[PDB]
Ligand binder design. Structure first.
Ligand SMILES: C[As](C)(=O)[O-]
Ligand code: NA
Length: 9
């Protein structure tokens, strides 16, 4: 299973 959560703020 693959999860990549990115946040740029
Ligand atoms: C190798 As996969 C994208 O089925 O977790
Ligand atoms: Na997988």
């Amino acid at each position: 299973q693959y999860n990549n959560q990115n946040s740029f703020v």
